[PDB]
Amino acid sequence: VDGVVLNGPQTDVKAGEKFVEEACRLIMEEVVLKATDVNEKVCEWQPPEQLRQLLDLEMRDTGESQDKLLKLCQDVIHFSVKTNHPRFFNQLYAGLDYYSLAARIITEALNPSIYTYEVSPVFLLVEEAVLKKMIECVGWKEGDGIFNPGGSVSNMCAMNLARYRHCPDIKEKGLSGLPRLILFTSAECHYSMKKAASFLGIGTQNVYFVETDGRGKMIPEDLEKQIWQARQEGAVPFLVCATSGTTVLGAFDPLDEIAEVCERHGLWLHVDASWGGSALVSRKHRRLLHGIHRADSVAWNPHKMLMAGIQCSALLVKDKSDLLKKCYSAKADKFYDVSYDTGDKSIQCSRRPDAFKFWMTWKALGTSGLEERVNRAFALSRYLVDEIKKREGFKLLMEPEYTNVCFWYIPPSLREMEEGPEFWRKLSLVAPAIKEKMMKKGSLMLGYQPHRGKVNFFRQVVISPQVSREDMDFLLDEIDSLGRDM
Amino acid sequence: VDGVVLNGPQTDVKAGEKFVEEACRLIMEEVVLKATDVNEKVCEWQPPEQLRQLLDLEMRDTGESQDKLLKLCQDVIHFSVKTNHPRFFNQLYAGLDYYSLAARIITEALNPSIYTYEVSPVFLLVEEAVLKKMIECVGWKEGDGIFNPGGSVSNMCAMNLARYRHCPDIKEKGLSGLPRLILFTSAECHYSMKKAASFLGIGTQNVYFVETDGRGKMIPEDLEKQIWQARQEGAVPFLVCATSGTTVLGAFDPLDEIAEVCERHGLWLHVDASWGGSALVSRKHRRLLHGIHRADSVAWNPHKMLMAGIQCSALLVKDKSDLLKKCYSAKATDKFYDVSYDTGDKSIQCSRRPDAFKFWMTWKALGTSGLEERVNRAFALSRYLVDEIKKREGFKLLMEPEYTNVCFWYIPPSLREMEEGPEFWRKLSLVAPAIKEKMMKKGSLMLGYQPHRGKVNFFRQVVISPQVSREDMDFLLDEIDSLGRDM
Ligand SMILES: *Cc1c(COP(=O)(O)O)cnc(C)c1O
Ligand SMILES: *Cc1c(COP(=O)(O)O)cnc(C)c1O
């Protein structure tokens, strides 16, 4: 010693290291080992103003003792939704993949960023591997891609690419003097298509929506109409965005008949497979994405159907001439193959190795194990279907094309009624009220939402391979019980 | 009963439960407990084609037994860079905060998304807490914000906000019929300002750069000049982006004199404090961002100076009328709780992680006082290395640092008796890349070297981790000197 302004190490490491070991056990005791126990509440509901009185969130000038901090962690787990609980069907993700989680913890400790090979050599070789594999599942011989934070941004990137490819001078000039650029998507499209059009300075008014048929599928005959009208307005079409697996219904646009339309006019074709993309793993169901190999770009989120954990979404491009680079290049030599850097393919600088956790799963299960996981979801989906039809008071909107089982629950008081406006206006308030109860019970969680002209209906999503047939029987047994007297 | 179309389960949990327990212990033994040990290699260098031949990355139809898988994890750590090693100064982050890691692991197991209160009640109350606290450090009375994946997106989001405020019809009509929108930033700005300008359909040609003085600081007299020229071209200025802590030099634009220029013309003022933002925690050094409370929006990444872990970047807005919402809304789908506590329509993202929770865990564990002291020690260690660099010969300092960005050349002995002419620089250029090549093969150090705005290859040092000691600074210069003495 010493110096100014006072030097040493000043740290209480060996204690702070225990807090990490103690947190690890909380994960094991209170999450990992209780992950498959159906006998636990999916959520400990407490309104906002009551949960504030339970957590002590104020960050004061002084710290808190290790006991008080371990209490917070004890509570943070107790009061949060259990996304791993087998009875969690509230989102397009659920369950706990043990192998992806172990990889997830690793990434957290190393705390790597994927600027370049010199900081993340392993994880950059893994992203190369995963992207190459995914590109095979699509059917391309070569390609290119990056991992974005959420398939929402993946679509944004693909929209920005289709604009750069159409007129790469937009990167420098901007859109001031350019005519109206127009993209075409289905009205069943994710809403990130809307945020994107605005964000990229294209405007939501320039997102032409193509009519869908009775199954939620885009109609390629109409698309030709919308592309000629756009031109005849003086506007410049440049992109078509189909969806292979919508969020609500799980529909699958016909990519082979859309590709034939995009190729007649030379328009980028982007397929939003954030949800249905994982079906490409199954030889049995990968036909849902027939013709995807004719698109120019594909979005795919493994954190959904394959339980990679949040976040994990990839954008794949059919190019190999560094178009990704040519589009996202900016400022910044020796001494290694600089090709293995990717800092200038993305809009972000820092980035986490989202693709590594998936790699850990694919190694642990192989394509064969992932194939079975996707296929089983379809079985459990179609099982719930067969059981829903047996019951009265459960109306199915349609046979699902994916694992999105959309149905109403009609209480007995509303049966023998007539299919008129007055009937719907009352059926509307059923799902939201059945959701209020199952959230206070902590025994179930399903999504309710309107769609198109349809009023509040349920959407069920089978993903986790811990779900059992008995978890589907309980779904209908539970909803029935909570809405029997409504 | 058992029946069609193939039912069970048949998952073999108890194995998957070991792999998690075994990985947890692997983390403890080989990372957490070895975090501060300086005598270990900062990195196990192996080129791609040799590291590819060592990891076996191929994803086959079949899986691999847990023993090979536990080997994989063992190798991934052995060959990866140790960002927690105290002698890691290669980027604007480093070190291991044990408390943020515990929070990182917690978030990791729950695997939550922050759509709404019904999915992430806790983490939404935590994000409200952090945002409110941060907004005080800025000096605002009230505000609004969200956590983005990386300060790059924070700048992108703030730039899109200023455009919505300037003409909110751009959200629907777009930019087709509108005149040229122009923003003004410093040439010392992060490059996400260029990526953003392109991405948002504004165009890089419309990013006017204001000249910098000898300290790297924007010159408010020029800023006024560029706004009159821009307008006199028929173009429409709408945003000014100052930087409170540049990446290379660590400069701090003068926010009070820039704000006065933005207020005379009614232009959004955005401060890129992704790096220097953490200085607001220090009463001594928070003067570097004097006048930030006059800006309309602030970006601030705790995953850097405060060691929150990646990723963690916040966008703060001076509004309270749900401008963030009004701008990033797509009301795509009501009782029975206060929907105000949802944030799904404030972001450009749909799904989102609780980046702010790990920081909250640190602030709780250390208090504002602990965060203040950690920031100050970095400043001291910076000024120590500075004073030590001047004592040594062969080390030329580009300038006195305003932050913890210590930029210096290393002049091998062969070039110390030369003259300060062109040929001198041209040879000095290849010094840093070759001194970096060795320390990466030695595995004993990692700091960044880069050219800059006409300066030739020089080193950049970033003091962050409070595990760094004077002995880690003396070794920095002793090591660089040793590796380049024979050049
Ligand atoms: C889930 C989804 C997205 C994007 O989801 P993120 O979690 O934001 O990545 C986009 N489109 C569809 C059809 C989706 O299901
Ligand atoms: C570190 C830094 C950033 C970081 O952006 P990321 O996308 O989070 O990596 C942006 N701007 C400046 C000035 C920075 O120092």
Numbering used by the authors:
A (entry chain B): 11 to 342, 349 to 502
B (entry chain A): 11 to 343, 349 to 502
What do the authors say?
PLP-dependent decarboxylases constitute a large family of enzymes that catalyze a range of metabolic reactions. One such enzyme is glutamic acid decarboxylase-like protein 1 (GADL1), which was originally named based on its sequence homology to glutamic acid decarboxylase (GAD), which synthesizes the inhibitory neurotransmitter γ-aminobutyric acid. However, GADL1 has no reactivity towards glutamic acid and therefore is unlikely to be involved in GABA signalling. Compared with CSAD, the activity of GADL1 towards cysteine sulfinic acid (CSA) as a substrate is much lower, and GADL1 has a stronger preference for aspartate, suggesting that GADL1 may be involved in the biosynthesis of β-alanine and its peptide derivatives, such as the neuro­protectant carnosine.
In this study, we describe the crystal structure of mouse GADL1 (MmGADL1). The diffraction quality was initially poor, with diffraction limits of around 6–7 Å and highly smeared reflections. Thus, the structure of the nontwinned crystal form is discussed here; essentially all features can also be seen in the twinned crystal. For both chains, residues 11–502 could be built, with the flexible loop common to PLP-dependent decarboxylases being absent from the electron density (approximately residues 340–350). The overall fold of MmGADL1 is similar to those of CSAD and other close homologues, with a flexible loop, not defined in electron density, from the apposing monomer covering the active site, which is possibly relevant in catalysis. Importantly, a large part of the active-site cavity wall will be formed by the flexible loop in the substrate-bound state; the flexible loop is invisible in most PLP-dependent decarboxylase crystal structures, but harbours a Tyr residue that is likely to be important for catalysis. While our GADL1 preparation is enzymatically active, and the crystal is apparently fully occupied with covalently bound PLP, we cannot currently rule out the presence of PLP-deficient GADL1 in the purified SAXS sample, since crystallization might have enriched a cofactor-bound conformation of the protein.
